[PDB]
Design a protein around this ligand. Structure first.
Ligand SMILES: Nc1ncnc2c1ncn2[C@@H]1O[C@H](COP(=O)(O)OP(=O)(O)NP(=O)(O)O)[C@@H](O)[C@H]1O
Ligand SMILES: Nc1ncnc2c1ncn2[C@@H]1O[C@H](COP(=O)(O)OP(=O)(O)NP(=O)(O)O)[C@@H](O)[C@H]1O
Ligand SMILES: NCC(=O)N[C@@H]1O[C@H](COP(=O)([O-])[O-])[C@@H](O)[C@H]1O
Ligand SMILES: NCC(=O)N[C@@H]1O[C@H](COP(=O)([O-])[O-])[C@@H](O)[C@H]1O
Ligand SMILES: [Mg+2]
Ligand SMILES: [Mg+2]
Ligand SMILES: [Mg+2]
Ligand SMILES: [Mg+2]
Ligand code: NA
Ligand code: NA
Lengths: 389, 389
């Protein structure tokens, strides 16, 4: 493996499609290796753009627009950071010789729940919640009837819980369906039976030249479609961990290509159930910014560049807690920062240009002798931040 | 501490005066907090510029040029990254209300080994090398006589050994007095009477809102005026450590201002002698990119922003080894990178635009069960990298 010098003729060029907080760290890790970074998104001054050599704002769902920016910048690697990309064009491009991380098929399969769900459950025979898809209200209604209550309805093309409803009674059916319509390419939906898990985890799995490597299990807590806190390591029985690893390995290998994947799993004792997978760094993995020698961002980079992982070091109990304020502003400020960092406590503020409602603008990170204590220290610190606009 | 959002009207702005590998990390740290970074250097595409919001190429020795850039960008913090800057302008600027990190006086004082040596020795009353001050070949001649063999000859405006001479013999004096003029402005000198130390350390000392904290001592190996390898923690006596810390505190507190300082000391048994100090992150300190929770750069930023440090966690034996090729090229590439990364091993490639002679293009970082082992791992890795032109 050979790397060039960013900005020079033989530069190794990486193009990020999506410039949120996740890509910002991928960008930093690229920059740490003198890798040239082109950050693209649907809006200007996106996080990853702050730390990139050059940025472009285009409609990433427009295959022609994508083709255009790619032809323009001639990246060696196209690193999708969000789901909402013109995957069909990535496949084209990949065929035309471009390297899509981890691979274009991985991106296509995961951007639509139907693809990844059917692959995992039907082709890989992995355990998942029960599910049905529906593309009309009536079909949706039949689906619910067959699935039972409670059940969760989600659009097949969504993230961070947009257009999703936890359905407890037929009473919600109409609202649920409309709402699932508002969320979505606005479309088809998935109706899943509710898994009553003991806890849920994210198994950050790196597929690299030297094999499949696993980060220690990251536990996470979700609320109202948003991850609130994550921690590592999440304790699991030996049997559960081994089962989780098995599932994760099968998934990443099936999707193909080098990179770090966020394998979302539900744990019921010693039993593990597959939920979904990010074929790229995962939000919950932001805890690895404090908990490992190589963050999930650093690992994604390492793997995609074709270099060996070797191993991953875990420094002990740690957690992340989101900074998710709710306001409307185009000039956001953060005060009381002196009460948000200190010993074994840090924060990250994304640089997002504005907010109009709820938005993840930063994250607090902490370490401690237990995840319980780390979680509290991180939440507390996130809380101390006085967000104003 | 109130921080704005980079690129937004209330953004908090940091201007780096010097954009090499040290400032690159400082920049990355600022970015992580959504701080707006302006990277200034005397050449284009300097490392820190790759990761800054914007840059400026100017002669930083030109005060009028410095004022212009400062006033144009209106930074909240001026962060010196190299010695060669117009310290007078800093002083003036500071007087005009500008925040200079750690303080303008600190920058001036350290530029001059005259001012700093006197302060430390006379004023602070700390142990240093022997010395005096010549201002002529005759003034030079007489002094070196007062010091004796062997001894050191340094321009009071020298760095990296720029203009220095190790004198064991009178014959040299023909040379030395000349060389002392080769370098610096191109002059006046300082003659030191060498100290036979067991080993040398850099005591990275952070002065912040919650007082002064210290990183574990960093040992290093110098060669031809360039550090080659650095390691942490350097084994020493608690007594030696205690003494080192006392000297460091005294110095930093006397220099004034918040920031990370690199205190250079000689260790002979339980005795410690102050050599010099950088009022900014120090090269040898690059080991902290892998050995601690907060790197020296993260500490620098934390401190200058008025935030508390609280503590510094050290992850065990670690080392840095420089990637210091010597060639002439404007399109450097790095091959065999796969043999330079792995478990507990990483590399940084700076992004320097070209090279023409010997130049530090990157660094290898490693951790291990022992300091010795760490150094070997880091050295080996740096050695595997094939630098092409
Ligand atoms: N079938 C299910 N049973 C139980 N809980 C579920 C189920 N599906 C989703 N959840 C819960 O809802 C959270 C969000 O679900 P998810 O399917 O990941 O939504 P998303 O919109 O894809 N979000 P993101 O992870 O940002 O892509 C999960 O982490 C669980 O806490
Ligand atoms: N009195 C002295 N005794 C022994 N070694 C010395 C002495 N002064 C300098 N050195 C050695 O010289 C190295 C570099 O010299 P130094 O005094 O730091 O000058 P410099 O030109 O300012 N270099 P730099 O460290 O980059 O600022 C040190 O790290 C020591 O190994
Ligand atoms: N679970 C998905 C996720 O965490 N995505 C992250 O959020 C960004 C969008 O946030 P935004 O909606 O605030 O612009 C994405 O770009 C990605 O980094
Ligand atoms: N020992 C001091 C030191 O390490 N300084 C670092 O090297 C730069 C200059 O490198 P360059 O000479 O290759 O431009 C400086 O800007 C600083 O980052
Ligand atoms: Mg999802
Ligand atoms: Mg999810
Ligand atoms: Mg110096
Ligand atoms: Mg020195
Ligand atoms: Na690929
Ligand atoms: Na100051």
């Amino acid at each position: 493996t050979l790397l060039g010098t960013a900005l020079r003729p033989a530069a190794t060029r990486v193009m990020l499609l999506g410039s949120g907080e996740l890509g910002k760290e991928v960008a930093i890790e690229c920059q740490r290796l003198g890798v040239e970074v082109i950050a693209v998104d649907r809006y200007a001054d996106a996080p990853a753009m702050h730390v990139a050599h050059r940025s472009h704002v285009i409609n990433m769902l427009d295959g022609d627009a994508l083709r255009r920016v790619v032809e323009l910048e001639k990246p060696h690697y196209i690193v999708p950071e969000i789901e909402a990309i013109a995957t069909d064009m990535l496949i084209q491009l990949e065929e035309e010789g471009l390297n899509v991380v981890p691979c274009a098929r991985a991106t296509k399969l995961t951007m639509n729940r139907e693809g990844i769900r059917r692959l995992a459950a039907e082709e890989l025979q992995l355990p998942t919640s029960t599910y049905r898809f529906a593309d009309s209200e009536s079909l949706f209604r039949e689906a619910v009837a067959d699935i039972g209550y409670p059940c969760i309805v989600k659009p097949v093309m969504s993230s961070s819980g947009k257009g999703q409803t936890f359905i407890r009674s037929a009473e919600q059916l109409a609202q649920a369906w409309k709402y699932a319509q508002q969320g979505g390419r606005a479309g088809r939906v998935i109706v899943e039976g509710v898994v009553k898990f003991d806890f849920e985890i994210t198994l950050l799995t790196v597929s690299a030249v030297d094999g499949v490597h696993f980060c220690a299990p990251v536990g996470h807590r979700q609320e109202d479609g948003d991850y609130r806190e994550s921690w590592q390591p999440q304790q699991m029985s030996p049997l559960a961990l081994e089962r989780a690893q098995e599932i994760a390995r099968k998934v990443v290998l099936a999707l193909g290509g080098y990179g770090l994947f966020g394998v979302e799993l539900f744990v019921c004792g010693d039993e593990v159930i597959f939920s979904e997978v990010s074929p790229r760094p995962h939000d919950t993995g932001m805890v690895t910014l404090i908990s490992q020698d190589l963050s999930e961002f650093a690992l994604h980079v390492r793997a995609f560049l074709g270099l060996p992982v070797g191993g991953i070091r875990q420094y002990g109990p740690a957690a992340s807690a989101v900074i998710l304020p709710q306001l409307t502003s185009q000039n956001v400020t953060f005060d009381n920062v002196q009460n948000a960092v200190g010993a074994d406590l840090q924060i990250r503020l994304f640089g997002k240009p504005e907010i109009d409602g709820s938005r993840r603008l930063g994250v607090a990170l902490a370490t401690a002798e237990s995840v319980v204590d780390a979680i509290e220290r991180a939440k507390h610190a996130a809380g101390q931040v006085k967000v104003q606009g």
